[PDB]
Structure formats: structure tokens, C-alpha cells
Ligand binder design. Sequence first.
Ligand SMILES: Cc1cc(CCCCCCCOc2ccc(C3=NCCO3)cc2)on1
Ligand SMILES: Cc1cc(CCCCCCCOc2ccc(C3=NCCO3)cc2)on1
Ligand SMILES: *C(=O)CCCCCCCCCCCCC
Ligand SMILES: *C(=O)CCCCCCCCCCCCC
Ligand SMILES: *C(=O)CCCCCCCCCCCCC
Lengths: 235, 235, 60, 4, 4, 4, 266, 279, 279, 54, 62, 62, 62
Amino acid sequence: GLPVLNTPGSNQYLTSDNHQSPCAIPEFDVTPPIDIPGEVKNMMELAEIDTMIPLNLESTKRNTMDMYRVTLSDSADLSQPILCLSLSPAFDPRLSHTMLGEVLNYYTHWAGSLKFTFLFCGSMMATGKILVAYAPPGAQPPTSRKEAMLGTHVIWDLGLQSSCTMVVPWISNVTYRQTTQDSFTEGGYISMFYQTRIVVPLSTPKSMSMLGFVSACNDFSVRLLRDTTHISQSA
Amino acid sequence: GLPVLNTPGSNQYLTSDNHQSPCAIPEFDVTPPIDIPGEVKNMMELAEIDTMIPLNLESTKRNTMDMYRVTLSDSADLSQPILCLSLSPAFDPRLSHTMLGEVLNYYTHWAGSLKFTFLFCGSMMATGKILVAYAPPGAQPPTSRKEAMLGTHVIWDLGLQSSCTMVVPWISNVTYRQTTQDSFTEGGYISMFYQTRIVVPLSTPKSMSMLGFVSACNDFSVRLLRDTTHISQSA
Amino acid sequence: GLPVLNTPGSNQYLTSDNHQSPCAIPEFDVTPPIDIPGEVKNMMELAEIDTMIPLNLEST
Amino acid sequence: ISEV
Amino acid sequence: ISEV
Amino acid sequence: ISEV
Amino acid sequence: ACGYSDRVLQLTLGNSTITTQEAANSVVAYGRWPEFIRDDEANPVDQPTEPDVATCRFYTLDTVMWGKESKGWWWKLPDALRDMGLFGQNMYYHYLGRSGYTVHVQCNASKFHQGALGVFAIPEYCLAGDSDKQRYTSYANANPGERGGKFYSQFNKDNAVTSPKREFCPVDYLLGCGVLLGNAFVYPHQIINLRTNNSATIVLPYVNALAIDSMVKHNNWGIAILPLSPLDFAQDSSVEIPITVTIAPMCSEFNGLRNVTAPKFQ
Amino acid sequence: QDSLPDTKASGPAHSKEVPALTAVETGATNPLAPSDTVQTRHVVQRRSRSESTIESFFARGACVAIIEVDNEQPTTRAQKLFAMWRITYKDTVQLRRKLEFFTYSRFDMEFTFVVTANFTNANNGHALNQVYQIMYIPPGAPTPKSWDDYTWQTSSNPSIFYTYGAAPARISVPYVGLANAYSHFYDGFAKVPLKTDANDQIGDSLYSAMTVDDFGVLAVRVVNDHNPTKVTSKVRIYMKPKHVRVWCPRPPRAVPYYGPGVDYRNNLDPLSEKGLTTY
Amino acid sequence: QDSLPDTKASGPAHSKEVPALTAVETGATNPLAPSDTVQTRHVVQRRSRSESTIESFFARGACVAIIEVDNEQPTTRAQKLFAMWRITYKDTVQLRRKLEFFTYSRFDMEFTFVVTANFTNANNGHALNQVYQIMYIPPGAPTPKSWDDYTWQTSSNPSIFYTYGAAPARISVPYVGLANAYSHFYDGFAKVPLKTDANDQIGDSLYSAMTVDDFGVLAVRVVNDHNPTKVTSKVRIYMKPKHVRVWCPRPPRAVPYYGPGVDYRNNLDPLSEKGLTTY
Amino acid sequence: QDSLPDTKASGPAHSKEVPALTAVETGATNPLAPSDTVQTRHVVQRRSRSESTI
Amino acid sequence: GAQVSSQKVGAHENSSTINYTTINYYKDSASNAASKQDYSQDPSKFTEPLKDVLIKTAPALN
Amino acid sequence: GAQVSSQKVGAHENSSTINYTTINYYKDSASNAASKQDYSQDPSKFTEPLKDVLIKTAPALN
Amino acid sequence: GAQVSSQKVGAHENSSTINYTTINYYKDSASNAASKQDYSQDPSKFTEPLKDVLIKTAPALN
Ligand SMILES: Cc1cc(CCCCCCCOc2ccc(C3=NCCO3)cc2)on1
Ligand SMILES: Cc1cc(CCCCCCCOc2ccc(C3=NCCO3)cc2)on1
Ligand SMILES: *C(=O)CCCCCCCCCCCCC
Ligand SMILES: *C(=O)CCCCCCCCCCCCC
Ligand SMILES: *C(=O)CCCCCCCCCCCCC
């Protein structure tokens, strides 16, 4: 009989633990694997896939196909923002339910660069130049293109290459931000403005949709696994 | 005293487990083995032995010697099936109690090819050609030789070699079928028809028995050990 | 703390068992053996010795 | 030891 | 043993 | 060790 | 080469020869030919008796008749041979005996007859009884000798609690023992299907949990013959053909010699 | 070494190479880094995706079931002296949603059992420590009709005898699927209706259901004979996938689950109201 | 490597070799593969018979007995203050039927003891934890007449002292048969009637029974002196064959067991009704 | 190896050596084996006194 | 005296040959767990107990 | 049969490479804990499933 | 300091020489379990305590 002494933690059950245990069905002939396509080794692979942003969550557009459609037009007020959004990938209502947002909602901490890709779904006869921007946190959130110009930005020229990508670079004080809303670990502001304007010829639609996409650049990571607020169950 | 920490599973009793335990009768002089004939190393060896199918479970024939006897005759309706049966080796009433059926009823999953051997127990002066068939699942179960011909089949000519063997090849979607009845893991249909007819001379019996046998081909296997419905006990 | 799991049989007492246990009187100077005649190594040695049969178990 |  |  |  | 066949066999043991022009090959039970007890499996220390040609030869039992109502016949070994010449004497003068056997079942009919016999060699063939009373079949009734016993189509319970018959009640489809007959094929066997063969030939090794035992107390093998398919001929409703069982002891040896055992068979 | 890529020092550009422009119609996601659109410094990256590996994402024991069983005097009306649970990850929502990020899966499964009990009534004396039996009954095996009938003899079925108060019971199970991977989604039926069928009930199946009993059941009972006073117990079952592999990613469940299939009923409005130009 | 044979690619045939034809009268089973009667592809076979090995088939602890024993005040009428069980796999049906697929067997035997207790009466105060003694009494040894007489001194008999609440007791036993293998079936008698016998009772034995006491008994008692209030306990015995070898296969029991021998009484109708040409 | 002695194959005797006769007055027990008084076969003995050790 | 063997790995984690270790603690082999590495044999003594075993492509009876 | 590997040390005490030891006790690999040393792969089968995968500096459409 | 010996195997599983391992944990040999590998001796000091031990085939008295 080897002399042993039981330490604290003895006979507890940790949900997170990693231990051996007896096999209830011994010598079972297991069905071998076959090479199925589409195998995933890591959840971040999914966050690197572009998914469509629900950019328009206005009263009659939310939980509707239109929540994905931003309207551009040749008669829009050029002083005004096309769209304004907070850099809170797991929390901001427009981002929190995208595939990126969903994976991040199973983690407490995120870090890395993000990229926004916009698709012009107008007619080919339609032209226009758009400025899209990212302001790192700490100052007044941009209400004018004049202010937005001063931060990180891409001037998108519409043409045969339909889509433009703005990379939001990892610019932060802390090494990892929180997936929840919090001023101490805040990400900053995203905004969009007309650099010139949408110009169409006659016999063409003067109004059209823009679609937005978001995904993670390869430097992106997440930590501290946690349960999501995005699913629940009643008694 | 070696510092130890008790993990979950501690002090449980698993019926399936494999552990060492103290010998209650130490230094006992064990009687040595002698070479007895008939040693078995694996239950499947028994399922590879041909046992007689209770093919005739009609009201007055079941649980009687006649349950093993199918009647053939020179005046049978040649449009009709001699016999029809489901490929459910552990469940179909005609198969479930054969030695194959019995071993499979101690397991939850089966896989592999089966073989049916029929014995003509008529007089030597009797001739005839019989078609025996296997239809893989998914279509209408064969009511006519015309339909049965289209699937896996053997045309048996009666003669000096008394018996014929039809191999039911492993044709399935899943890697292992269930031993119980289930449409998702179903095996298909077995049927028998007159290719020509039984022809006898005068002063000969016009009617005779056919016996059926079933066993497992060498590719056959079973898994997930379980208790059988074929034995029970009252309070 | 080495992660251990208690198996069935744990904390039982088998009369037939063969295990180590703590010595209640440590470092005791044991009296050495001396060569005594008549040592037995096995009970069968005794069964090989001729003993007298009570052949007559009649009433008196 | 005995490795099989 | 196996050291990786 | 001691193997007997 | 020359002209040889699976169907034509000659068996010769001692001063006895069997021929058959219509056999269906022949079976060696469990792939083991009969043999004598090896020095390293030996248990009684006394020098054995091996009578050889005087006991290891073909004893033919009383013929039975197979008819349309015949449900099946059974025998136990060595019991069927207890009164057969010097084998019987050796068996009864010794406490211990072991023997293997060549069993030859004989049943010929004609190209126009019909029927099939299942011939089965069962190790330890324990049979079921008469009663509400368990394990109650008497020695005299359990051992019919050469005469053998029979099967029945159904279980008739011996009701007379006052004077019980203490007999077996072997039901055919239950192989007389609580299991289904269809599965008896896991036992060493042959089939006499009359369109194919005259006879069955099974060679039995000595099978037991011991190298040797008491032949008087315990039977090693049971021979069960059941009509797997009923006898039929032309249109004659009352057909009847003979079945003859001829058995030979093989590699017979005996230990523990003393005065003769006289069992009470009444 | 499992760290992510270092950021490269990137300078000004005046060129015909335009990484910022693309066409998402192609089906592909633009492989861009900050150095492709902004001037960047050199960063030596030490961060790692260690915790988001498929194993690490599922390496946690989830509550999949609550089985209630009583020990009391056997009367003659419906009672819980034994209970049966169909093995599934679907009576619960949390683990179900994590597994459903993927179409197919392959893994070994760890079962941990937390058993709790209490007294029901104010007082009829007390109870001695209870031993619980958890019997696995695979599809085909005899199911108990009575808390102590012959099935509980468990000669071939695996069973756990849990003593109350001991550390929670734990066992492991192999990959036991009939296919080469578990199907979290099955678009189809177990039966097909044929034109030649007698009733049209014969070929009717549940959409997306496969085998009727899937993995069988767990039969739980208290092995002790009943005390004078009644004791109620609950067995909580914790399930953990281990040695995990997964195939074909899927969008996460966005509205509440309505039974075993992909069916929705209500609260089909997952998203909040937010103004287009409101941060 | 324990996988089954690969299926060979097999083509069309027009030959004098006829594997489909045979003669079962010979006693042999036709060694056929699908490639002998149908065109087959090449399959690389990975399936295995690992779980149907004799060891794997019996490697499971089966309930063979339920011993009831009480601890209460010693009165003067028949009581259960101690109990005795004849060691056998035959008071139960499940393991018995598995062992009976074979005529002879040889194995070591593992005994596991699950002990449960409860209060009998509504209330006379309570009880302190009980220690149980399980004494093996081999044929020949003195059997107890009293729950605490001298036999329980157990100086040469093996005994387990089980403390209530501890993990179930477990011991192993060697192959202890008088023969070279255990006889699951014995066609014969332990005595022969001789013509020279006085009564014909002298030579009468039970058919198929061997030694009168076979393996002896287990005597169970509660070592504690009685409480004011009564405690009833049950010892469930689980039996597992290990390091198993078996000889001569037998058909499985098809009708219900009627005591220790091959005797049947009723429910001799195992098979269902099914029409000859009905799928 | 702790097994007991093998039994030796022993034949007929017609000799002046008489192992069956002795004198227990001496104090000694006659060292006889079955082969000294009966015809014996060769047995390879596997039994052992392991359980009767002190 | 430790015994080391390979496990037949069914479901593989995304990480080759894996082993396990066994040590007998007791003198009596009866005390030992089951090795479960069990060899197989031919059904032939049951499926083909014939004195003249014949090849499947040739006539059973000749 | 013991398995020895390096731990990825996060917070270091004021004391280099530290290891841990693992021994499988059971025959069935199902019984085993998780190794958690998991390799990663390319998102490309999901992020770029194109027949003609193009370089990011060149036109997506040409 | 581990001690390794062969077990005398009685009933063999369908899988040769099997061992077991022993380690004394205590200083006092009194604390030790029993080795049970016990040698045997001649009964002669009891069965034949004679000054002139005689051969069994010759006369006991002469
Ligand atoms: C659909 C689907 C289902 C799953 C999970 C499948 C897990 C299947 C496990 C089947 C066996 O489960 C058992 C549970 C408990 C026990 C047990 N034995 C002793 C007591 O507990 C045995 C088997 O993944 N996809
Ligand atoms: C007939 C037949 C019977 C069998 C099984 C035989 C097993 C025989 C075992 C005999 C000894 O059983 C014991 C059980 C328990 C104990 C024990 N000792 C301390 C308390 O429990 C000792 C021996 O197989 N065929
Ligand atoms: C062979 O076994 C030599 C190596 C032993 C390594 C240490 C084993 C620790 C367990 C010893 C158990 C002793 C049980 C009586
Ligand atoms: C390889 O493992 C050889 C070294 C073993 C060292 C001693 C291990 C002590 C633990 C053994 C566990 C046995 C579990 C069945
Ligand atoms: C000789 O014993 C050297 C090998 C030791 C192997 C590890 C043993 C683990 C058990 C040590 C017990 C110490 C008890 C005081």
C-alpha cells in the first residue's frame, strides 16, 4: 500500500478539466474516417470569412432583407454621413451578429486588425467617389467628412472593380480589448461620406444599394472562452 | 505520503471496467488445461456456421418441425412467390432465432455479406429450375419474378449437387446497420420464384420439401455489446 | 498532487490479502534465530509421516 | 520494461 | 519514454 | 531494479 | 486418378469392414481424430488396458423403422454399447474408461423415395424430463442402452405425482433440451437426404472436461437422428424404410480394474 | 511556435498595384493586411490562437440533461422509482448551438454525472446512503418496466453504480456513429412513399430524422429499497466532446430553437433597432 | 492488424467451376464470398471483430444474486441476522444464457459486491454506519448456526469486511474446478444403482448434477450489534469471467429456464407468426 | 518449478527385492510409491504443494 | 516491470502511434485485469469438419 | 511508456523550459484525455475557393 | 529499488511469461508483505530419523 496524502481539490469536479476516465464500451470497432471536404481546425478561420453586415437597423428595416442594404443616390445630402458605426465587433448591433461577431461572443477578449469590404450594387452606367474612414478612440466622433479625412481612410472610386476594402489596423493601448462594451477598451469610430457624388446618366436609376462585409485580418485572435448572450432557454 | 488528488469517477463501479483486484484464495494450485476439441476464440465463428432457417412461420406450422419445411410442387402457381423475406438478420422472425440471428441479438450493430443455402429434399427423379433473389432497399418489394430478376439473383438448377447458395453482398449506405428494425438502416428484400417448374415422372411424389440455411461470409462483423430480448425472467 | 481515481475494492478488508502496513514498534532489536531441530517448511511433510489408524470404532 |  |  |  | 470418389467408401476396423457406394464424404468432429491419453495429460497412475481389435470394431445396433409419423430417435455413448461383446465387459470391470467412435448411420431407399435425416453428434447431450420435478429422470430411464429413445412432437407432462415415470420428454423442435433444432447444426453432423446419399459417417474424438472418466456414470456423446424432411414415396400413405446404426469404439483405454459393475436396469 | 504573423514595416505607395480594390462577386474574401492600405511599423507578434482551436472551443463539460428519480414505497399509480432518458445533446440549447457551427463531426464523448438528493416531506424518520444505478440500454435491448425487474441484471449492457456523496461519476465513450462522421444536419427522410403503397402512412417519415432511437437510452434507478420517508434525487448529465474533428461550417442559430429540427416558431426578430448614422 | 479480408475485384464468368452449387449433406458450410456469385469491386476492408472475441463478449459484470440480511434485535423466531448463498451463476438468467453458448469453460472469476441498506420502520431513533462480513465457506467447512458464533472467526476461510458507503467490494478468484475445465453441461449421474443394493434409494442421484455442494457458500452478516430501530440491507453480487477460454459451441436457450437443468416446462412457443410470402 | 514427482512407468516383477515388506518398529515410514507394488504408467506430474507451505 | 503497448486509436484529435502502460501489482495471475489482445482462429473445425475438405469451385459430391 | 512535453509558460516565477508528464492508463484511446497540441491550417478553402486564385495586388476581374 | 518476478499463471487468456512488481515502502522488514515464494524440504528428519537409513528394496531388519 503506497503511502498517499490527499491534497485540496480532491474529489471536486471542474468543468474545464482534462483527465482520463474508464471506457464504458470496451473494444468497440470504430468506423474509420473518410476524407470529407470543408474541415475546420480553428474557430478563427470562420471569422476570416467575409459575412454580410446588417448595416441598416432602422425601425422598419431591421429583421428584414433591407437591414443589409444601404441606399446611395445622386441626390443625397453630400454634407451628411452615409453611415456611422462603432468599432465594437462583438457588441455593436450591426457587427455582433455577423460570423465574426458570433465567434467573438463566445470569447471575452479580442485583438487584431479588421477589414471592411463594400460592394456597389448599382447599374454599370453609375459612377461616384466615396470616402470611408476609421478614427481611433479619444476624440469627437466624426460628423463631417472634413473631420473623418484626418483619420485612417480609403477613397473609393467606383468602377469595374466593384468593391473596396478598408483595413481597420490594430491600434490600441491594451494588448487585448473586451468583447463587451467598455470605454476603457474602446475601439473607435467608422464612418462613410461622399467624396464627390453618385452620378448617373438619363434613363438610369438614380438610387441604388450598397452592401457591406466584415472579416478578420490574419493577425486577429481571441481568448477566455465564455457562454454567449445570443442564445437562451426558458423553463 | 505521496501528494494525490482524487479525480471524478473516483469510487464508482463501472460494469464494463477492466481493473486489478485482490485474490481471495492465494497460492491455489490450479488444475492445468488439457487439449479439449472444439475451442472457440470468437463469437463470429458461430455465425459462419450454416443453421436451418424457420422459413415457414404460418399459423399451424410455427413452433413445429414444419416451420423448417417449405413445400415445392409440380402444380404450384408459377406466377407466385415460393417465399418472401426481409433482410433483417437479427429482427426478421424467420432469421432472428437462427445461430446468426442469436449472436447478432447480443450486439447493436452488424455489417458484412450473408449467404443463403437451399437444400432440395425431393426424390432423385425430380427436376426443376428455381430463381432466388435479393433486391437492395428503396424500391417496391418484388411481387413478380419479372421484378425479382432485375436485382441480385441466382438461377438454381436442381440435380446431383443438391444445394444452391446465394450470397447476399454487403450493399449499404451506412458502414454498419442496426440489429433492430429500422427503415434508415434497412437491408432490402429476399425472394424466391419458379424459373421453370418442378417436373416429376409418374409413380413419383409431386410434392416435396425444401430446407433453407443461413450464415455469415468472412467479411462479416458486429459491434456494441448489449443484452438480448430473447431471454427474460419473472419476479 | 498526482491525479488518482479510486477503483472498486477501495477501503475493503480482505482476510486473505497480502499488503504492507506501518510498523508499530520501530527500530526494535530482534532476537536472532538459533538452529532449532525439527523445522517444518510445508504441512504435507506431516501427512507423509505414518500415524496410527483408529481402525476399531465399535461401540465399546 | 517490456514494450510490445 | 517519449520526449517531444 | 532487481529482476528474479 | 484411376476412378476414386467421395461417394464410395470402405471403413475397416478390427475384423469388420463397411462398404458404401453412396456416401456424402465423411465428418471428423471438431477436426480431431481419436487418440490415446498422453503422458503429460495423464491422471490415473496405474497402467491402462488397451484391448484394441477386440473392442475397437463395428458393433451393429438393433434396426429401427422410419415411417411417416416417425419424430426422431436418440442414443447415448458409451451407453448404446454397454452390452456389446468385450467392449461392454471392459467398460464394466473398470472404474475408468475413455473411447472415441466411428459412427455409421445406414438408410437406403430408391430414386423415387423422398426424405431427409438430420444426424447429429452432441457433446454432453443433456435431455429434458417428464415432470414438474427438476433433474429427476432416473438412471434406468436415462440410459436405454442399444434400444435408444425417441422424440415427441409435443410436451406431455407426466402427471401421476404418486408414482412418477421419471422419464425424459424429448420434444423434437426443441432438440429435446430447451433450444431450437434449426441450430443443432453447430454440432458435428451429416444429412441423409435420400436423393443424394445412403449413409452418414461421423468420426468422434473423446470429448470431456477430463482426460478420462466413469463410463457407467456419464455419457460423453449423444447421437440424435431427426427427420428434417418427412419420408414419402409414390402416393402410398404408409411407407416404411429401415435405419441401421453401426458404431465402432476407437482408441479405447481403461483404468481402475476391479470386480464387475452390475447396474440395476429395472 | 503558434504565434500569429509579424506586422511588416510598410512605406508610402504610388503604384499600379491596387490591393484596396476588389470584386466580392467572385466568392472570395480580400486577403488584406494593414500594410496594404496604411503605413505600418514592424511589430514582432507574440499572440496566439491556442484557445480557439476546435478542441479548446469544445473542451468543457456541458449540462445536457436533468433526470429525476425517486425512492419511495412502491404503490400502484404512476411513479418515478426509475427513469429513462433518450441520449441527446438537444434537450438543452447551449452545447447544441456550439456543435451546430458545423455540419459534420467526429469525436469521443465524456460523460460526467452529478447526483443530488433531498427529503420531500417534513418528517417520517430518515434514510441511509443511496446507491444509484445508471444503465445504458442500446437500441434493441429490453427496456425495464419495473424498477427492479430482470433487465437491471445488466449482464451485457454497461452500467454505473454510483454511491451518493462520492465524487461525480465519469465515463468515456468511443466514436459510435454508423456513418464516418456524426450528422448534425440531415436534409432528407428515413422512408420514401412509393406509388404502389397501400396506405400513404407506410412511407411517411419525420423530415430530417434518421434512425428512430439514435443512440438508445439511459435508465436510472435507486438500487436501495425504500425508506419509510421519501427521498427525491436528480442526476445531472454533463457531456464533453474530446479528440474532436469537424466539417463544413454553418451560420450560428440566430432565433430560438423549436424542437429537434431546424424549425422556428417565434422571436424571429434577433436584431435591435439602431439608426444608420448613429455610433 | 485485426481487420477482415479485403473484397477482391471480380469480373464476369463463363466456366465449368460452379461455387454456387454444393451439397449440405456433407456436414460442411459453403465457403462463399460475394465475388463467387456477383461482379464485385475492390474494397480495402478496415472493419474488425475486436468486440466479438470470447473475452470481449463476457467482459462485463453480471448480477448473479441478491442476498438480504437484517440487523435488528435478536429475538427467538426465524430471522435474517445472517444469510447464506450457494455460489452459482444459475439463480439469474442473463449471464447463464451467455455461458451456455458453450459446453466447457475455463476462467478466473471477479466478484464485485454492491451493498445497499434502508430503515424498515417509520421511527425508533437511528443507526450508526454498518460493517458487513462476507465469509466464504468451502464444502466441508463448518456453517454458522448463529450470526455471531465461532465460525465467523474466519481463521482459514477468506472473508471480506465491507464498510457501508465505501466503493463496492471487489475480489478475484482462480480457476477452481476439479476438472480441467468447468462443465456447463453434464449428461450423467453422481451415483449408479447396483443390482446388489439394499434399497433402491442408495443409488439414486439427480440427473445432470455433479458434486452436492459444487463451490460452497457465501455467508453474509452485519458485524454491528443491533440498533433500537431495525436496518435491512441487500448485497448484490456481480460476477465477471476473466482470462476466458471456451469449448464446444451449443445452440442458445430458446425457451424459459426451469431450474438448474435443461428442463423445460412452458412457453415452448418461441417463434412468432409470419406469412411465408410476407416480407 | 514446484511440481511433484512424475510417476514412472513400472513393469512386472519377479525378484528378491521386497519393498512391500518392512518393520515400523524402527521408527521410520516406508518410502513407497505406486510403482513399487503395482504396474504403473508414465505420468508427467503438474500438481504442486504451493498452498500447503507454512 | 512495466508493460507498454499501442492502443488501436479510433477517433483522432487534431494533434500517429499512441501507447498505454500496465503494471501487475499482485502475485496471483487471477488478480490481473484482462489483456484484451486476443488472437483469432479458423472457423474450419466447425464450418468444414470433413475428412476430405474440398475446394469450393469443384463438385461437393463427385 | 511516459510521455514528456514542454509547457508554453505564460507568467514566469523569478527562478527557461518547463515540462509536464503524461501516462495513458487505459487500453481504449477513447479513455484518454485531450493532448491539446493542435495544429492549424489555411482558411483558403473557405476564404478563397477559386479555380483561378488571384494575387491581391492585381485586378480581381480582368 | 523495484522488485520484479514471474507469476505462476493458472488460467490463460487467449492473448507466455507474465510478471508483477513489488516495492517496499517501509524501513522495518516487519512492515513487509509476504513474498510467498517458499522453498520446500525433505520429510526425512521426520519420516526416516534413522542412524542407518536403509534402502526400501532391502530388509528393514537384517
Ligand atoms: C446526433 C449526435 C449525437 C451526438 C453525441 C453522440 C454520443 C453517443 C453516445 C452513445 C452512448 O452513450 C452512452 C452514455 C452513457 C453510458 C453509460 N454506460 C454505463 C452508464 O453510463 C453508455 C453509453 O453527436 N451528434
Ligand atoms: C458450474 C459453474 C460455476 C462456475 C463459476 C465458478 C466460480 C467458483 C468460485 C468459487 C469461489 O467463490 C468465492 C466467492 C467469494 C469469495 C469471497 N471470499 C471473501 C469474501 O468473498 C471466495 C470464493 O462456472 N461453471
Ligand atoms: C517494473 O515494474 C519496474 C518499474 C517500476 C516503476 C515504479 C512502479 C510504481 C508502482 C509499483 C507498484 C508496487 C505494487 C505492489
Ligand atoms: C512507461 O510507461 C514505462 C514507465 C512507467 C513508470 C511507472 C508508471 C507508474 C504508473 C503505472 C500505471 C499503470 C496503470 C494501469
Ligand atoms: C527503486 O525503488 C527505484 C525506483 C523507484 C520508482 C518510483 C517509485 C514510486 C514509489 C516510491 C515509494 C516511496 C515510499 C516511501
